[PDB]
Amino acid sequence: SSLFKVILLGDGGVGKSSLMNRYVTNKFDTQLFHTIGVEFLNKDLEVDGHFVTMQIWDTAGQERFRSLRTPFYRGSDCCLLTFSVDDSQSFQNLSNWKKEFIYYADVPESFPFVILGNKIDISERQVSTEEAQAWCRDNGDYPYFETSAKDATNVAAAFEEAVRRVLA
Numbered sequence: 001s002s003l004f005k006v007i008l009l010g011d012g013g014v015g016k017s018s019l020m021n022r023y024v025t026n027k028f029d030t031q032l033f034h035t036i037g038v039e040f041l042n043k044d045l046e047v048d049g050h051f052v053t054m055q056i057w058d059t060a061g062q063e064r065f066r067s068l069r070t071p072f073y074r075g076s077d078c079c080l081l082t083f084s085v086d087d088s089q090s091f092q093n094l095s096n097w098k099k100e101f102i103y104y105a106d107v108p109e110s111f112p113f114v115i116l117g118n119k120i121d122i123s124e125r126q127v128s129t130e131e132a133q134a135w136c137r138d139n140g141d142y143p144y145f146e147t148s149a150k151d152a153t154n155v156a157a158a159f160e161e162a163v164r165r166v167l168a
């Protein structure tokens, strides 16, 4: 309706649940449930003088739980591919997540994707801003945000870009 859907995809542990909670409730809690399956929260917004609800999903990241999450890709209006900057592996797996999304979502190389490098509050990184920025350029020229769910840094900024991408 005035409802649109976005999904966070990325390895387990990169901070998807926390990013959602920070965006939606402006809190960083340390003991979120571990969900074997998928999860969502409603974000009530107002764009162009209208009420719009962004429904934010994410999933379990383990390969063995693929079958539990891919039925909920459908209807996603934007995909937030997430890694954490402290974890090169998570960054290396971005193409994997994009391909999985594309396979199962059935949405076009014009689909809205947004890339979040999370846990930037972590000074000891495995991934440089430049290589992530690089990757985004060469892989669809997606917008890139360095975020911290813990300290809230760029989190609304990244979700707002998603909103406008969808709305566009």
Ligand SMILES: Nc1nc2c(ncn2[C@@H]2O[C@H](COP(=O)(O)OP(=O)(O)O)[C@@H](O)[C@H]2O)c(=O)[nH]1
Residues within 6 Å of the ligand: 010, 011, 012, 013, 014, 015, 016, 017, 018, 019, 029, 030, 032, 058, 061, 118, 119, 120, 121, 122, 147, 148, 149, 150, 151
């Ligand atoms: N330092 C730091 N820890 C974070 C951040 N985001 C999430 N966490 C922690 O990372 C761990 C995995 O978080 P979670 O939100 O469940 O990641 P998910 O599996 O991708 O949903 C948890 O212990 C979180 O508290 C962040 O930006 N910075």
Ligand SMILES: [Sr+2]
Residues within 6 Å of the ligand: 013, 016, 017, 018, 032, 033, 034, 035
């Ligand atoms: Sr989680």
